[PDB]
Swiss-Prot record, chains A, C:
Name of the protein in its database record: Spindle pole body component 110
Family, per entry: Belongs to the SPC110 family.
Span within the parent record: 166 to 205 of 944
Organism of provenance: Saccharomyces cerevisiae (strain ATCC 204508 / S288c) (Baker's yeast)
Compartmental location: Nucleus; Cytoplasm, Cytoskeleton, Microtubule organizing center, Spindle pole body
Biological role stated in the UniProt entry: Component of the spindle pole body (SPB) required for the proper execution of spindle pole body (SPB) duplication. Potential role in cross-linking filaments or anchoring other molecules. It is essential for growth.
Other comment: Present with 279 molecules/cell in log phase SD medium.
Bilayer-spanning residue ranges: none
Subunit structure and binding partners: Homodimer. Component of the SPC110 complex containing at least CMD1, SPC29 and SCP110. Interacts with SPC97 and SPC98.
Swiss-Prot record, chain D:
GO annotation terms (biological process): cytoplasmic microtubule organization; meiotic cell cycle; microtubule nucleation; mitotic cell cycle; regulation of microtubule nucleation; spindle assembly
Family designation: Belongs to the TUBGCP family.
Function: Involved in microtubule organization by the microtubule organizing center, the spindle pole body (SPB). Probably part of the microtubule attachment site at the SPB.
Cellular compartments per GO CC: cytoplasm; gamma-tubulin complex; gamma-tubulin small complex; inner plaque of spindle pole body; microtubule; mitotic spindle pole body; nucleus; outer plaque of spindle pole body
Localization (cell): Nucleus; Cytoplasm, Cytoskeleton, Microtubule organizing center, Spindle pole body
Name of the molecule in the record: Spindle pole body component SPC97
From Swiss-Prot, chain E:
Family of the protein in this entry: Belongs to the TUBGCP family.
Comment field (misc): Present with 2230 molecules/cell in log phase SD medium.
Domain of life: Eukaryota
Name of the protein in question: Spindle pole body component SPC97
Function: Involved in microtubule organization by the microtubule organizing center, the spindle pole body (SPB). Probably part of the microtubule attachment site at the SPB.
Lineage: Eukaryota, Fungi, Dikarya, Ascomycota, Saccharomycotina
Annotated organism of origin: Saccharomyces cerevisiae (strain ATCC 204508 / S288c) (Baker's yeast)
Subunit structure: Interacts with TUB4, SPC72 and SPC98.
Compartments where found: Nucleus; Cytoplasm, Cytoskeleton, Microtubule organizing center, Spindle pole body
Signal peptide bounds: none
Gene: SPC97
UniProtKB/Swiss-Prot annotation, chain F:
Protein name from the UniProt record: Spindle pole body component SPC98
Cellular localisation: Nucleus; Cytoplasm, Cytoskeleton, Microtubule organizing center, Spindle pole body
SUBUNIT field: Interacts with TUB4, SPC72 and SPC97.
Encoding gene, per UniProt annotation: SPC98
Note: Present with 56 molecules/cell in log phase SD medium.
Shown chain mapped onto the complete sequence: 163 to 423 of 846
Keyword check for Phosphoprotein: yes
Function: Involved in microtubule organization by the microtubule organizing center, the spindle pole body (SPB). Probably part of the microtubule attachment site at the SPB.
GO molecular function: gamma-tubulin binding
Superkingdom of origin organism: Eukaryota
The species this protein was found in: Saccharomyces cerevisiae (strain ATCC 204508 / S288c)
Keyword Transferase: no
Amino acid sequence: KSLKHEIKELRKEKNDTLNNYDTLEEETDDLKNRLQALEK
Amino acid sequence: KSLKHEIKELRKEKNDTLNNYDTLEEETDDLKNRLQALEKE
Amino acid sequence: KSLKHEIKELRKEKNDTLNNYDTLEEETDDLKNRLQALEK
Amino acid sequence: MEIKEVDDRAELLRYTNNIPLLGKLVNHQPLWSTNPKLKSFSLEKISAPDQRRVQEALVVKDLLNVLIGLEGTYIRYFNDYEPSDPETPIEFKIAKKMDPSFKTFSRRIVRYGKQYMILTRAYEKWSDTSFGMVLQRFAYEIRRFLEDVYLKTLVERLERDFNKVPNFSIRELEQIINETEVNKQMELLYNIYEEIFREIEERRTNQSSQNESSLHLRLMVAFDTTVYPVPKGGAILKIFQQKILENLGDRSSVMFLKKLLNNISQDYCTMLYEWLTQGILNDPYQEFMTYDDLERAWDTQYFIRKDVLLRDCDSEEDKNLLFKMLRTGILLKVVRASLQIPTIPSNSSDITIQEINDFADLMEGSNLELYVDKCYSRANEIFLKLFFQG
Amino acid sequence: MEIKEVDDRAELLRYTNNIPLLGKLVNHQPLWSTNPKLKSFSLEKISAPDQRRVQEALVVKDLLNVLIGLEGTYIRYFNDYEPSDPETPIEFKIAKKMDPSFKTFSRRIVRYGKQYMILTRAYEKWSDTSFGMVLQRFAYEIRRFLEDVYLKTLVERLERDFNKVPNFSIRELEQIINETEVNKQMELLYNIYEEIFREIEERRTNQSSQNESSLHLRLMVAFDTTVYPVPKGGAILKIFQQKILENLGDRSSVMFLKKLLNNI
Amino acid sequence: SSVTLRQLSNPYYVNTIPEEDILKYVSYTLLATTSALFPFDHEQIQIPSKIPNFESGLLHLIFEAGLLYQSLGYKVEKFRMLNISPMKKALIIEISEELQNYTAFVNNLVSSGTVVSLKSLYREIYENIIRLRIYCRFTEHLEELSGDTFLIELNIFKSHGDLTIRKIATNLFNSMISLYYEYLMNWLTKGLLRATYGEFFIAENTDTNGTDDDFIYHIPIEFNQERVPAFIPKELAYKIFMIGKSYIFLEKYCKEVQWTN
């Protein structure tokens, strides 16, 4: 039951980390879309 | 008790994913610094 | 018995010489590769 | 594209107890979400109409990889996909910057890729012993279908045209998928999978749920109303006959489903034939319509698995036929045990019984009735000869 | 590959007093370690995935030459090999710049080459009179196996495919060896040879050694409890029966060993 | 527009290993060997970094066959030097014969030149991957189960619905049952319990407790009714035991050597 509970927490943390990574990549792309008009 | 292998695999995969996330935040900070140098002028 | 002794000593010297030869050839080849890069 | 450096190693799984008889024994490749091996060349740099076909090439490459459940560069696994979990959900997330027409086509192809993954996982799972050889033969049929139709079509048409055919496209990819009907055959197999899965889920959650004709005869018998966790034998042949009743009018679908029903049920027809002609019970997966106990030697009490019956057992004629089959088998086993013989000679009566070569043909009309009537008359002749002369 | 100049005179042996009856009477060819007749073209220069099949062909040639005990250009006897001494050890050393897959397959085939060398040397030795007619017939069966099976396979399959069959390769070489049973039968013969060798060694070291029915009967007969230096007769037929027992279940090995026993 | 989509996709995958070299080295990796591209480790294949995640996944699927071939070869080479019963040797021989057929099939694929892509190579070896999977599952507990337990398990698997599992189980059963028939033949024609390793339902029992130390009254042979295989009736098992006991009796105590022979 403790091993299954650690798996449930680690899966939730993986899913949250991936949704945050996708969100941070959208922020990264928005920052590139601002910056490329200045650096070109 | 072999559920410990999914625990170790998830912990390693999380740490790899967090190294990607931290690298993407360093790239985010570089872009923000380059914007703060140019976008104000 | 004396002839058998000399045979054993000569066999040992042969084996050591051959092992030294290979060690030396490996050094020789590393030097050749470095030189080919330098002459090129 | 740049190259990232991740430690990728193929190796057999160390812990193989929770893996079915045909489960994948090699570990999973590095996922794009956590271990990308390529600095992804973002798509909008080739979004212009002159780089549209380059984008199409990349997307069709990724789709040829997805059609077997591998993730491409721009079509990656869902965020909730966990490869080390045999029960994990399966979805694909498509690069947001992809051309919207390519995105639609790639969704419609991702559908068949996910169906492929699910069916592969399903034959791996049902290859186990606890599922009965009807479901096992079905899993074998799924695997045979994938390997010899779907993989053949992919490899020899879509990938081969990607490699060979100029002016190839993604719309031609979907058209070729629809031509060979492989999408309709996959839809049929996936509908059967979904029905078996829904029934398993009902049997696993609707667990709290729980005739004088059985006494009007001289029987040491009992009904076995145990609703098993997974449907077996007749419970799955009912699923297939129902999917034939539903898909009437589409005649290719019906021919496919009938080929399936005739292949899967071969071993079941063999069981029923051996029971009605020899009173043999070679049921190692506990799926026949009747069984005995003591698995003193002759002190056998027969049970009837109400779960795996071919018919309903509700009407009058249905119970008549059911008890006539059970009675034929009982009499023939009694004869075999009396003569201490392992089988009954084929010439021990003048009524010859032919095997079952088309299951649907047996179940459809009254062929089951007449067949069991023939077997019952032959069994009664042999049995009364035994009891009146020996 | 450019020629080197060495002296290679093939002459009979001068002293044949310590040579068995069937022992080899010619001298040994020049070894690569001391007298190479070619400048070895290093394999690193064909390690490119396009020149991979060239190195494959060179290794296959060296392997077809090793399979009869003859060292190749890139597979050679190791340092302690002394060809004059007949009790020399036998191993091959493989060029360290070879492709690792080719090194693996080459070690696998070098196993068979070394087994051939040791078995040829074994029947040569056991052709003497001091070994008994059972070991002499076993040596005859070993030599007939080599000549009529091992060399027949080698030439008519391996060399004919190396000379006439495209798509041939080292992995197909090992496949051909495994399919013709030559590896299994030669492994059987080599196991029997090794058992006879451990027996000879025990009888050479175990020198610390020492029925009333012959008196209950009027028999002027004694027991000769001598433990000879080499097994003879029944002491070898027992080895063969023990092998047939240890191979119970491998009907091909049992048939081979039973035909060997019926012949010997 | 004669440029195919492969030639349009290539310029973005030029920093990766071309498919033809992957195929050249997979030729060896499928046979459990190392190479310059796939440095096959102890029990790992170490896929390089120049192989993207899709080719890497396909190579994992393909190299399942190489790793299974390696594990089965390890089993064969282990049990080839051990002291195992004849029936386990027949199982090992069937394993090695499957490995030999797999090697022949992989060599035919590679040498034919008809394999031009990793996906076609995966489809071609798919059923062979499945057969190696079955063979590696059936023999996971080889050193821990006796031959008759294997007979019982393969008799359970002779009724499997999958035709491949059923056929493999049937062949394994037929070989082990050939050697069990050899056991029975030895016992029925010679009274021999030679090299049965406790797989037979008749064991020599020289274990006595001072009563009949020289077997004047005993014939030291016991008959375990719990070891009779399910495909032999207990009546015929008792008849087998009695035939062997009567042969040994007639030959050893009745000194009836000519008639027993």
